Amino acid sequence: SSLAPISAKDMLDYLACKDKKPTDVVKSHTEVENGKIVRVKCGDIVALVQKAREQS
Amino acid sequence: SSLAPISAKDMLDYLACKDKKPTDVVKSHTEVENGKIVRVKCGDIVALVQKAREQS
Amino acid sequence: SLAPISAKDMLDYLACKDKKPTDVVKSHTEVENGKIVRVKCGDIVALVQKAREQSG
Amino acid sequence: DISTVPDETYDALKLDRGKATPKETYEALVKRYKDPAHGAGKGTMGDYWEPIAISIYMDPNTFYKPPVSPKEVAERKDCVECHSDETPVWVRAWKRSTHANLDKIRNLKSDDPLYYKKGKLEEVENNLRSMGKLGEKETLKEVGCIDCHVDVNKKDKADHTKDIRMPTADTCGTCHLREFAERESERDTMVWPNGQWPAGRPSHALDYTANIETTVWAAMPQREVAEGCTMCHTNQNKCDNCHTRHEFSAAESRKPEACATCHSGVDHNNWEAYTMSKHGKLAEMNRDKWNWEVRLKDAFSKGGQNAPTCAACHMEYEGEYTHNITRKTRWANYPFVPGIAENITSDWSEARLDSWVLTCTQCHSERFARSYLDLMDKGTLEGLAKYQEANAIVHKMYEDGTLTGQKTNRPNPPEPEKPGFGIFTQLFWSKGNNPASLELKVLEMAENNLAKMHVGLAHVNPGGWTYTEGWGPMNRAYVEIQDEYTKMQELSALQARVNKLEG
Amino acid sequence: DISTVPDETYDALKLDRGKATPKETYEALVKRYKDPAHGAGKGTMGDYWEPIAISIYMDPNTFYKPPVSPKEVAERKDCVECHSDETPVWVRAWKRSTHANLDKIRNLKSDDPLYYKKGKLEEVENNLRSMGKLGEKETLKEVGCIDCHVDVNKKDKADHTKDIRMPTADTCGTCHLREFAERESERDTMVWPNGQWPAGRPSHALDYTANIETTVWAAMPQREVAEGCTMCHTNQNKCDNCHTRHEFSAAESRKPEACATCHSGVDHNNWEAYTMSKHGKLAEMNRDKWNWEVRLKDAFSKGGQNAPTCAACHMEYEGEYTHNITRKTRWANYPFVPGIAENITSDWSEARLDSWVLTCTQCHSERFARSYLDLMDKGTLEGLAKYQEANAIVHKMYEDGTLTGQKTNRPNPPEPEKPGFGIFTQLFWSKGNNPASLELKVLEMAENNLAKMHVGLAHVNPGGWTYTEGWGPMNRAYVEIQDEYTKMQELSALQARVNKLEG
Amino acid sequence: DISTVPDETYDALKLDRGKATPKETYEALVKRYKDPAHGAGKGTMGDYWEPIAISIYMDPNTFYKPPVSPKEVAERKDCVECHSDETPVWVRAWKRSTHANLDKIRNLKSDDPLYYKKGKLEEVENNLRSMGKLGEKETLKEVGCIDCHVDVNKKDKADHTKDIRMPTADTCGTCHLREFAERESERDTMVWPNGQWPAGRPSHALDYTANIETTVWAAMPQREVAEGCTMCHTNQNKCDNCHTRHEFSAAESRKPEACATCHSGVDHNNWEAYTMSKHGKLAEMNRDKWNWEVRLKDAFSKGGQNAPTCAACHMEYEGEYTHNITRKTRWANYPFVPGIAENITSDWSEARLDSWVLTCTQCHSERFARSYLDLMDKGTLEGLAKYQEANAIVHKMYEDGTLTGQKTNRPNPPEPEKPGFGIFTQLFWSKGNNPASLELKVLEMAENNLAKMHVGLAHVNPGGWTYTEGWGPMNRAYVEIQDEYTKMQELSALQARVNKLEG
Ligand code: HEC
Ligand code: HEC
Ligand code: HEC
Ligand code: HEC
Ligand code: HEC
Ligand code: ISW
Ligand code: ISW
Ligand code: ISW
Ligand SMILES: O=C1C=CC(=O)c2c(O)cccc21
Ligand SMILES: O=C1C=CC(=O)c2c(O)cccc21
């Protein structure tokens, strides 16, 4: 079947969190807000990816 | 003398109507109307070209 | 810090080197009223020398 | 059996590898190759377009017929004699070709690096003997004009007005069954797990099918313009696009310049990116020190090649070089295709990623190779996200109907294309405000700039995804999309106050 | 008599082919060459521009004078010795040149493919004796610095402050009268039936005249910018633009790279289109297998050339290779020129079309050659119609005065240029809203994109008229012209309602 | 003493030229090279960016650590054996290199043009003896993997997980102290009189420092995009960007193609401008006639080179060729930099102009050389003035706050960048209407078009500053800036009348 859509900003935050603990926080590779790079908790992005994979 | 001006769409419809009967219908090479390629009757394009040949 | 000089003035200065102050040359960039602007060498050289004294 | 043909090809042809003979395997390939259900013919939209004069050479199996003049009959030698003054270079190029000097291959000693051509010469004869084209002990003397253009190893008369044909891929496959099966294997190896692309695509085996199955290619009236696309999509029909006629030099096809005519442009600048890379510039500086005549398997050892080429990087798979160039594809040049980015972390892509590392570890280290390939994947996603943010702005206007002339002057595309937002048809057809400036700008932002960004990342040209191509133009597209969107919002707010004063 | 010079050249010079001596023919060529009425001098707009430092080398017959330093007198041998360290490569390049080794040509046997240079050596000596440059028993020793830069076959001292000259075309024509007459024949062969271009243009014989007769070239104040155009238009003045100084290699001029510096750019990308074609990429892969020293007549047989080059396609006419490159021009690169498209079906174009087919049939067949040339003609007309529809929109606004800033901020172009719509001056001069964005965009749509489309069609680069160049950008220009036109229409309708509320 | 190192280098290092030994000079160079105060390390903004996988190869002295696998210890011969199958081409390229065949340099006779390499081999050994790297009677056997990647002239075992290093510039300088000192001299020779650029910049010695000290390079989140900039700024860290690994061919670095990957693009098209010039096209036609193996000093005499290359023009200074390419810089590619134009007439610039004429006089005359260099300077100012007029229009709108979305949707740049008008950060970062279209268009008008204009002037490509690049695009940018300014003024005037009707 067709794979569930995932935005490229989410793919990068997912790729940046590989081999890292879910509580680790990394900088987004594309998002910038209030003059700073948006920080992404690794537990949230992996959860956002897995919730889309289960819909496939 | 100077040659009479002929639009490129008329040049293409004339070349598509060469060695063709005046009643034949060919496809335009550039025009599209109402979501379909415009059909040009060969009698009309040759008449428009011949009226330009006599003005040269 | 060096004093700022517009590029049109640099060109008019190069065209007035080894020339009399009363000589008039054509600008290399300016066009007004459908003609190239003529620049008197006495004015452009004076504008450069007043900028040289503000340099270090 | 052909050891360079994957299992998926025999499985799709209902053949057993052990018992399949060169004649039996060839017949099964031609059946699917010439089947209109598998892409042959004028395609599904053949009722909307008609061929032109040059089209008989682009798709010979569908449109070609021999010329009415001259009305002469000729033997094998009569082709060389009459055409020695009708096509003088064609005869002189054929004379130097290996096809006319087969005894020059048999007398090559075992120490000369070109001894591998003798094994293929015997294999070529091996494929013909199974088909009953020559005796089991009779040797192939030459490959003349009558062989390719009429019938392989013909000994009798041929009519120039009835029997002349354009040598298509199957004509080349009669003798070169190995290379023809490897290219046709692309229909079976290039299968996407989530259906991102049609099965067997993108590939040289279905480039003509993809070309004629493009809606805008059949719908647009400018047939001479659309046939220009066909000239880059003729690998399916003929096999002289890398080793050209009539020299048919294998050393020529290995050079990077053979891929330049097709794999270059605003939507896939592989030639521009590779040449400007260190890999390509080294190929331009050291092409006089390399032996291009040796095969790709021996190019790094017996050829003295120290920089990678298009044939070396793309035709290699797990240490073997075949005419299948799809077994390592992951991104397929267009990152915006749905499912391509989401599949880059799958085991399907990771297996092909390891296959690419195996190609680079022939020179670099595995740590260095994977260090840059990770940059290619993440760098491509960084560009993809830049387009997705700009596309959300233009797509919002499309659903809101606020695009320029969207509701006033937006004529329908030529049949059989349906009107849409940011469709490929708008790249080669335009009328009125269809497409709009914002609609075309964001379309090209992905179709052209984002693609050239990934190409620059895949072919190590730093400027190819930073300043010159990719991130540079995408930044400009993002800025101008934001600028026009804010401008049109201000214009809408200004027009809203005018409607208030009139109501 | 020179058998490679057409009848129109002798007829225009009032000379009889049989009785005309090399001395009489040379004087008649120089008379027209240096006549200000035939393009020599500063041109009709010479009162608007003044030369710069580099202009003495671009137009030597008008501006060059010997330098005041040094004040030394020199013989023939003193030229080589002192310049061996003042201009070391010029001396070292000239020694390597054939001009310094003329006895090396006499020992060439008849079996050597370069024996034709001996016949030209004797022809050069034969022309010099007709002019009274040496005794009938004296042999030409060498072609030294004093020969080209002072006087041919000078035997006494020369003053470096009085006798030094830049060797112009007539200076080269003193010895090479054949090639000089062939180039000068372009004034007489290139005559358009309906006056689409000035007589003798476009041609290498009047490229400098065309440059100085361009209004913007004389009107613009940026002389250093305009003189850059001159650097591509110096074939009329000097003859070292293909076989450069001081090697003057005939093998160099036959290579495609010799035409690249001039025939390349946004309005005529012949170098980009040819190289990216299969013909050009084949020339890049096989340039080590070809004998560039052999002449073009033997290049396809005795030179081993299997792909066409710039010199092979354009200098050939009815089987003979001459320095006249105008006898096969039909489109002249710019399809939007009035009368060019309507003349493509005339007997004048059809005769030159048959002359092009004769060039193609040296390799391809006549059916294949005419099949693509028909694509080039129709494809150019298909692109031309795309511009004509977009030009009608912008020209519609110009006559209506609705262009941006047309009535508020549109200053006149620099004298002696008259204000107009979409003029060539607006490409190199701009002030205020003169030109406008739409006006410049549609101007570039024809001057740049439409021109590059035909170039891609004429030089078989499929991407050159589809995705990358030609139809690609023309499609975008059509979209952006339609988008801005609809926007300005909506802006005008909104402004009309404001005037309604104020009335 | 190194005779090719300027006095300013020894003076800046507090050393006396005469008595300083190679060991003493090397330690002083490495001290400043690895000093974070002189550009080493992560830079002043190191807390804003983190390295990626490829960064351990881009800046090894800051990020590189040996790989955890394999965990084996190896001698010299074990490097060649195991890597003969792990990186087979790396071994085969090193075997062909001069580093593996040092006895081939000692047996070179005096008649061989490559005899100068023996003097460098003896000088390399002389530098190592001062540093205690080999016996006073021991000859350098080879330059193996363990020498560059572990320690120079190592005789015992080495741990693959602890002692493996990436050969940085100082690693190359242990043996090649001359070329390492010449490159590091750029920190001291490139000093601008009014501080137009930072001291020692632009130069290959501080290209990585300039890269990491760029605000947008550290602020932007797209590390894979920003690291593409790093790949062109690695000359400071490693020395294999011209003579690549692992052949390290001096003939390769002399070719123009070695500089193409970095000196090419939208802001500095030096490769595009040179190649399309007559100088470059001659280098493509005559690269088979030149002996690239001879040094640059002997390239014009013993190499037969008649056309200039990148290394010949830029590494030359007063007749000597060194790795310092800054002692003749005048324009520094970017004419819009404050103080650059005003400094072009100073004695500092005029002295370097005279140094360029000495480079040009190798072929041309001083009159011809100064004639075109006068065109380059005046032509560069003519383009600069065109941008200055257009920048005044956009800068007026910025100060007036009338830019699109300047006060409504203009988010701040990523830290530590402060918001501004026409800043370099807006080329690689954009969000909302920051930057605006006019703001980015005038920025690119100078950063890209004006820069490529001067490059075309400096590298004699006539189309590079007229039609295609430079004046062409600058004209379009000027037109479109003028058009949008008139449109927004009319839109502002129309909006003012709406507020009048509402008041
Ligand atoms: C049987 C009559 C053949 C036909 C049909 C085709 N080829 Fe062939 N070719 C044949 C042999 C026995 C050989 C020599 C052995 C070998 O495999 O090399 C060749 C040669 C070639 C080559 C090699 C070029 C070189 O540098 O040695 C190429 C690249 C080639 N041929 C291409 C080719 C193409 C494209 C064909 C279809 C049009 C084709 N060949 C048909 C035998 C026969
Ligand atoms: C008489 C003093 C001459 C002048 C003036 C010029 N040329 Fe010459 N050239 C001359 C001779 C006797 C020859 C040898 C015979 C021949 O083949 O022409 C040449 C040679 C050339 C060549 C070919 C060199 C090669 O290696 O093939 C070229 C391309 C050439 N000449 C060009 C040329 C130009 C551009 C001149 C004006 C600067 C010029 N020639 C003047 C004799 C004389
Ligand atoms: C580019 C269009 C050129 C211009 C301008 C000039 N020449 Fe030329 N020349 C050119 C080519 C491509 C060739 C090769 C012709 C062939 O058949 O291979 C030549 C040849 C010559 C020669 C012949 C020398 C030889 O073949 O040995 C001569 C003597 C020559 N050219 C001289 C010459 C002169 C006098 C010119 C100014 C009128 C001139 N050339 C201009 C390309 C071009
Ligand atoms: C054969 C494939 C050619 C090669 C090789 C080159 N050119 Fe060409 N050229 C060719 C054709 C069929 C045409 C158009 C014919 C027509 O009907 O107009 C052209 C056109 C040009 C022109 C304009 C002159 C003309 O005859 O139309 C120029 C100035 C031109 N081409 C330049 C050019 C250059 C620089 C080449 C080497 C890179 C070159 N041509 C090669 C055919 C062929
Ligand atoms: C001592 C073990 C060395 C180290 C460390 C480096 N190089 Fe070297 N190299 C060395 C010698 C004795 C020679 C002989 C030739 C010479 O000119 O000295 C070389 C050779 C080169 C060359 C020229 C090769 C050629 O074929 O001309 C180059 C361009 C070169 N070396 C570059 C280079 C670089 C980039 C280094 C750091 C990675 C480096 N060398 C280190 C000895 C030694
Ligand atoms: C003209 C309108 C053209 C048509 C109808 C056409 N091409 Fe092409 N082309 C490539 C990508 C495609 C695809 C996509 C993949 C698929 O559907 O199978 C289609 C249908 C198509 N073209 C038909 C690629 C792939 C790039 C990559 O790196 O993966 C090519 C390589 C390619 C050659 C090509 C050329 C040659 C220069 C031209 C002018 C066109 N195409 C035009 C276009
Ligand atoms: C700068 C402003 C320039 C001027 C004044 C100029 N050129 Fe050019 N050029 C070609 C076409 C022309 C013509 C047209 C034909 C005619 O009227 O006689 C003129 C007046 C002209 N230029 C003067 C062509 C033809 C293209 C083709 O394929 O037929 C060239 C080839 C050509 C060289 C050239 C260059 C070199 C790169 C440059 C920078 C310019 N021209 C600029 C331009
Ligand atoms: C990406 C955002 C990039 C950064 C951070 C960067 N480069 Fe570069 N580059 C050149 C000019 C500069 C400068 C200017 C002078 C200085 O401050 O020292 C900086 C800080 C810089 N780059 C860092 C030049 C100069 C051109 C000339 O002729 O003088 C180069 C050559 C150069 C290589 C380069 C590349 C390689 C292709 C890329 C992709 C970038 N830079 C991106 C850019
Ligand atoms: O060229 C194409 C790239 C992506 C794509 O989706 C596509 C398509 O859907 C139809 C025709 C061409 C293309
Ligand atoms: O370069 C030119 C192309 C077309 C044209 O019409 C023209 C022109 O009319 C005057 C100067 C140059 C040109």
Same structural domain for residues D200 and D313? no
Chains that touch C (3 or more CB pairs under 8 A): E, F
Domain that holds residue E496: 270-503
For F258, the token pair is: 């070695």
Same structural domain for residues F146 and F216? yes
Helix (H, G, I), strand (E, B) or coil at F321: strand
Q: Are F242 and F249 in contact (CB under 8 A)?
A: no
Q: What count of residues does chain E have?
A: 503
Same structural domain for residues D341 and D484? yes
Cα–Cα distances (Å) from B55 to B2, B17, B48, in that order, read: 10, 21, 11
For F374, the token pair is: 């006068």
Quote the CA–CA distance of E77 and E79 in Å, as a whole number: 5
CB-count burial class (<10 Å; 0-12, 13-18, 19+) for D78: middle
Quote the CA–CA distance of D327 and E151 in Å, as a whole number: 69
Name the closest ligand to CA E355: 4
Q: What spacing in Å lies between the alpha carbon of E61 and ligand 7's midpoint?
A: 21
Same structural domain for residues F30 and F88? yes
Between the CA atoms of F264, F268, F269 and F271, what dihedral angle is there, to the nearest 10 degrees?
A: -50
Q: Write the CB contacts of E493 (distance below 8 Å, at least 6 apart in sequence).
A: none
Q: Do B30 and D222 lie within an 8 Å CB cutoff?
A: yes
What are the helix (H) ranges across A1-56?
A: 8-16, 42-53
CB-count burial class (<10 Å; 0-12, 13-18, 19+) for D31: exposed
> Of D240, D261, D284, which closes a domain?
D240
Quote the CA–CA distance of F326 and F331 in Å, as a whole number: 11
Give the CA angle between residues F382, F386, F387 to the nearest 5°: 120
Quote the CA–CA distance of F225 and D478 in Å, as a whole number: 16
For E134, the token pair is: 């040496």
Give the closest residue (by CA) to ligand 5 atom 9: F99
Facing residue for D413 by CB, picked from B30, B31, B35: B35
Same structural domain for residues E360 and E308? yes
Q: Is residue E128 part of a domain?
A: yes
Instruction: Write the DSSP string, B2-20.
Output: PPPP--HHHHHHHHHHTTS
Instruction: Write the DSSP string, F405-450.
Output: TTTTS-PPPSTTPPP-SS-THHHH--BTTBS-HHHHHHHHIIIIII
What are the helix (H) ranges across E286-365?
A: 310-314, 347-360
Domain that holds residue C54: 1-56
Q: B27 has which bridge partners?
A: B39
User: Determination technique for this PDB entry?
Assistant: X-ray
Quote the CA–CA distance of E99 and E122 in Å, as a whole number: 14
Q: Which amino acid is at F392?
A: A
Instruction: Write the DSSP string, E227-245.
Output: HHHHHTS-TTT-S-SSS-T
Q: Is D495 left (phi over 0), alpha (psi -120 to 50) or beta?
A: alpha
Q: B32 has which bridge partners?
A: B37
Report the number of distinct structural domains present in chain D: 2
Q: Which amino acid is at F177?
A: L
Q: A32 has which bridge partners?
A: A37
* Residue among E149, E233, E314, E459 flagged as catalytic: E233
CB-count burial class (<10 Å; 0-12, 13-18, 19+) for F119: exposed
Quote the CA–CA distance of E476 and D449 in Å, as a whole number: 14
Q: Are B18 and B53 in contact (CB under 8 A)?
A: no
Quote the CA–CA distance of E447 and E216 in Å, as a whole number: 15
Determine contact: F229 vs chain D, CB below 8 A. Answer: yes
Q: Are E48 and E221 in contact (CB under 8 A)?
A: no
Cα–Cα distances (Å) from F137 to F106, F122, F125, in that order, read: 15, 12, 10
Half-sphere exposure of D212 (CA within 13 A, CB side): 25
Determine contact: F498 vs chain D, CB below 8 A. Answer: yes
- Cα E418 to its chain centre, rounded Å, is 27
Q: B40 has which bridge partners?
A: B26
Q: Are F211 and D462 in contact (CB under 8 A)?
A: no
Q: Is residue D388 part of a domain?
A: yes
Quote the CA–CA distance of E5 and E185 in Å, as a whole number: 7
What are the strands, taking DSSP E only, across D242-365?
316-317, 320-321
Q: Which helix (H) or strand (E) holds C14?
A: helix C7-16
For D426, the token pair is: 């708008």
Q: Is residue F55 part of a domain?
A: yes
Helix (H, G, I), strand (E, B) or coil at A25: strand
Q: Are D144 and D80 in contact (CB under 8 A)?
A: yes
Q: Write the CB contacts of F166 (distance below 8 Å, at least 6 apart in sequence).
A: F56, F57, F60, F64, F149, F238
CB-count burial class (<10 Å; 0-12, 13-18, 19+) for E220: buried
Residue of E443, E445, E403, E452 whose CA lies nearest to E424: E443
Q: Are D296 and D305 in contact (CB under 8 A)?
A: no
Quote the CA–CA distance of E465 and E468 in Å, as a whole number: 7
Q: Do A35 and F411 lie within an 8 Å CB cutoff?
A: yes
What are the helix (H) ranges across F232-323?
A: 250-254, 270-276, 278-285, 310-314
First to last CA, chain A: 7
List, as own/partner pairs, every contact residues F334-337 make where C-beta atoms lie below 8 angstroms and the sequence separation is at least 24, other chains included. Answer: F334/F267, F334/F446, F334/F447, F334/F450, F334/F451, F335/F380, F335/F381, F335/F383, F335/F384, F335/F446, F335/F450, F335/F451, F335/F453, F335/F454, F336/F384, F336/F387, F336/F446, F336/F447, F336/F450, F337/F196, F337/F197
Residue of F407, F404, F443, F401 whose CA lies nearest to F422: F443
Q: What spacing in Å lies between the alpha carbon of E468 and ligand 5's midpoint?
A: 44
Q: Are C39 and C12 in contact (CB under 8 A)?
A: yes
Q: Write the CB contacts of F309 (distance below 8 Å, at least 6 apart in sequence).
A: F254, F255, F256, F283
For E151, the token pair is: 């006087």
Same structural domain for residues E300 and E234? no
Residue of F440, F334, F456 whose CA lies nearest to F384: F334
Angle of helix E437-444 relative to helix E471-502, nearest 10 degrees, comes to 160
- F251-284 burial by CB neighbour count: b if 16+ within 10 A, else e? bbbbbbbbbbbbbbbbbbbbbbbbbbbbbbbbbb
For E431, the token pair is: 């002030």
Same structural domain for residues F202 and F328? no
Half-sphere exposure of F166 (CA within 13 A, CB side): 23
Give the CA angle between residues E94, F371, F289 to the nearest 5°: 30
* Max intra-chain CA distance, chain A: 41
DSSP-assigned letter for residue D431: B
Same structural domain for residues D483 and D346? yes
First to last CA, chain F: 83
Quote the CA–CA distance of F104 and E60 in Å, as a whole number: 53
Report the number of distinct structural domains present in chain C: 1
Q: Write the CB contacts of F384 (distance below 8 Å, at least 6 apart in sequence).
A: C7, F335, F336, F341, F450
Quote the CA–CA distance of C12 and E164 in Å, as a whole number: 33
Q: What count of residues does chain C have?
A: 56
Quote the CA–CA distance of F255 and C23 in Å, as a whole number: 49
Helix (H, G, I), strand (E, B) or coil at D1: coil
Q: Write the CB contacts of F135 (distance below 8 Å, at least 6 apart in sequence).
A: none
Q: Which helix (H) or strand (E) holds C7?
A: helix C7-16
Q: Write the CB contacts of A7 (distance below 8 Å, at least 6 apart in sequence).
A: D385, D388
- E420-433 burial by CB neighbour count: b if 16+ within 10 A, else e? ebbbbbbbbbbbbb
Using an 8 Å CB-CB cutoff, list chain E residues near B30: 382, 385-386
* Interchain touch A–F (≥3 Cβ pairs closer than 8 Å): yes
Same structural domain for residues D420 and D364? yes
Quote the CA–CA distance of F258 and F235 in Å, as a whole number: 13
D374 is a catalytic site residue: no
List the 1-56 stretch of B: residues with Cβ below 8 A of E. Answer: 1-9, 11-12, 14-15, 29-30
Residue of D358, D353, D395, D355 whose CA lies nearest to D378: D353
| Dihedral of alpha carbons E211, E216, E221, E222, sign | negative
Count other Cβ atoms within 10 Å, centred on residue E85: 9
Using an 8 Å CB-CB cutoff, list chain C residues near E412: 33-34
Helix (H, G, I), strand (E, B) or coil at C38: strand
Name the closest ligand to CA D232: 6
Half-sphere exposure of F435 (CA within 13 A, CB side): 25
CB-count burial class (<10 Å; 0-12, 13-18, 19+) for B18: exposed
| Dihedral of alpha carbons D191, D193, D197, D203, sign | negative
Same structural domain for residues E201 and E308? no
Angle of helix F471-502 relative to helix F451-458, nearest 10 degrees, comes to 160
Cβ < 6 Å from ligand 5: which residues? F 98-99, 102, 105, 117, 120-121, 124, 140, 143, 147-148, 152, 167, 171-172, 174-176, 239-240, 243, 248-250
| Dihedral of alpha carbons D175, D179, D182, D187, sign | negative
- Cα E45 to its chain centre, rounded Å, is 21
| Dihedral of alpha carbons D199, D201, D207, D212, sign | positive
Instruction: Report chain A's C-alpha Rg in angstroms.
Output: 12
Give the closest residue (by CA) to ligand 9 atom 8: D424
Q: Are F414 and F220 in contact (CB under 8 A)?
A: yes
For F310, the token pair is: 């990148």
Q: Are F291 and F298 in contact (CB under 8 A)?
A: no
* Residue among E149, E204, E246, E268 flagged as catalytic: E268
Q: Are F54 and D371 in contact (CB under 8 A)?
A: yes
D267 is a catalytic site residue: yes
For F230, the token pair is: 């790093």
Quote the CA–CA distance of E392 and E396 in Å, as a whole number: 6
Q: What are phi and psi of D122, to 5 degrees?
A: -70, -35
Same structural domain for residues E319 and E378? yes
Same structural domain for residues F493 and F392? yes
Q: Are C28 and C13 in contact (CB under 8 A)?
A: no
Place of tokens 């075997």: F95
Q: Are F382 and E224 in contact (CB under 8 A)?
A: yes
Q: Is residue E249 part of a domain?
A: no
- B38-52 burial by CB neighbour count: b if 16+ within 10 A, else e? bebebeebbeebeeb
Count other Cβ atoms within 10 Å, centred on residue F399: 10
Q: What spacing in Å lies between the alpha carbon of D164 and ligand 1's midpoint?
A: 19
Q: What count of residues does chain B have?
A: 56
Q: Are E349 and E373 in contact (CB under 8 A)?
A: no
Quote the CA–CA distance of F434 and D474 in Å, as a whole number: 14
Q: Are F199 and F191 in contact (CB under 8 A)?
A: yes
Quote the CA–CA distance of D352 and D372 in Å, as a whole number: 15
Q: Is residue E369 part of a domain?
A: yes
Instruction: Write the DSSP string, E60-92.
Output: HHHH----S----EE-HHHHHHHHHHHSHHHHH
Facing residue for D382 by CB, picked from A3, A6, A29: A29
Q: Write the CB contacts of E164 (distance below 8 Å, at least 6 apart in sequence).
A: E66, E67, E149, E150, E158
Count other Cβ atoms within 10 Å, centred on residue D136: 8
Q: What are phi and psi of D320, to 5 degrees?
A: -115, 140
